[PDB]
Amino acid sequence: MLSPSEIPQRDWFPSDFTFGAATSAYQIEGAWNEDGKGESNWDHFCHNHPERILDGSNSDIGANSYHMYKTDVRLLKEMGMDAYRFSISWPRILPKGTKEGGINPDGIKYYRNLINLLLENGIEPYVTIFHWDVPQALEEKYGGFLDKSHKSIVEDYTYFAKVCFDNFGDKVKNWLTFNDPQTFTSVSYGTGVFAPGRCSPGLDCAYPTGNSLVEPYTAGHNILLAHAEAVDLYNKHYKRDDTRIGLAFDVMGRVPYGTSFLDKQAEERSWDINLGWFLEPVVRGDYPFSMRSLARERLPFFKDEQKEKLAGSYNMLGLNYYTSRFSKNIDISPNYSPVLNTDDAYASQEVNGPDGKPIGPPMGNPWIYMYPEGLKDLLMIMKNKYGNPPIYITENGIGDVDTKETPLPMEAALNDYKRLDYIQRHIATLKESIDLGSNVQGYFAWSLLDNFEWFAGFTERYGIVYVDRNNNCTRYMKESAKWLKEFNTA
Ligand SMILES: COc1ccc2c(c1)O[C@@H](O[C@@H]1O[C@H](CO)[C@@H](O)[C@H](O)[C@H]1O)C(=O)N2O
Known about the structure:
Helix content is 38%, strand content 15%. The chain has helices at residues 25-28, 41-48, 65-78, 90-93, 105-120, 136-142, 152-168, 181-188, 215-237, 261-284, 289-295, 304-310, 372-384, 410-414, 417-435, 479-489; strands at 18-22, 83-87, 124-130, 174-179, 244-250, 253-256, 316-320, 324-329, 347-350, 391-395, 400-401, 440-446, 460-461, 465-468, 474-477. The site of a molecule of 2 linked components (HBO-BGC) has 12 residues, from helix 8. It is found in: Plastid, Chloroplast. It comes from Zea mays (Maize).
């Protein structure tokens, strides 16, 4: 849909800029109980109540990347990708979650083999330590990130990070402690659509015996205390001049719904609760003012020693960006009371503006609307407000819908011109943002592979490479992957 002169070229970007693709462990690996790996929260979730995954599926196999990793690397290599973002499975390294439980030599060997193979193919590993797959042994012991002591999860996570640094840090120069913290907390413990599926009594989820106005914030502050300890560890013993550590935030761009100053206020509260929640702690050592004023006692306080450790705890940062929303003011009044942690923004997040028209063209699935300007907005915030740190777009993509009711022919799934156009426009926005002074240094397409998309299961294909599950998870390059190959190698 873009004109030939508006199509991004690789020479639009500095030679040290990084293009890559991304996955996560639970979503692609399979081999859930093989070679000494312990159960995760998502394993027990999918399997004690398969009715809570939309299509009744799980990731026992996924894309079978534990066995098929050589082909993943082959595909990355063919496409000329500079880098690959994958995560390490906590229960695969440490089946009981703990130093007690001991290190699983086969887990270590897997990621060691993946890493060496990527590097010998000139592909830089960007390693996410944790992508939502908490060892089930830790969930039963103390609730995982719901840990009320705010110490046990912190120590256990830190030791896991230690193991990763100790076994992979010679070769891995780019670490991310967490990925998508706002989605993990808000969806797992707020709406409870994600494992372990907890929400306030009354709401529709597997375990409605939590608190959607509190538990997301509890899990969130444990995440922050854990990243701060791991970075503290990393800086003391493992940081070298050419290595970097950070974390990756999910963020939906925010635009004022109408012309009123109230909606500008709503917009700012929405950036704050989505981006600011986890960003502002790692930048300055505390949550956004707005969240503290609105969540109040539901948002725990950091101790002074914790603030020091948190502030400046990154060398780089990731942004996971898919879409944007219009933010519309809600007043404080006796006519309104927050139900979900995200309602503490006092702003409704609308797809359609005042003219009835969507913010951008719909990309196929329930929630992605194409709005590359919001990516630009986000980058200008990071630039002008939060010190312009080194930024990677660690996720960007769309999901093609493919279900029993409405199956997607393989020819149409491979002819993914919607995805291709979406990717091109967003890469073009990075060009525009760099020119404006953004310190963005790379871009990762979300989903190297069609994979298990959490609640959506296999109903959404986010891959630039198709995975044929009817066969033996055979990979086929889509048009998007073919364009990326041309782009990277020209
Ligand atoms: C049930 O539908 C929803 C509701 C809310 C969210 C999502 C789906 O997607 C969430 O998380 C993304 O999922 C992909 C993989 O599934 C991750 O790789 C990506 O990093 C996540 O952002 C999300 O955006 N929701 O809050």
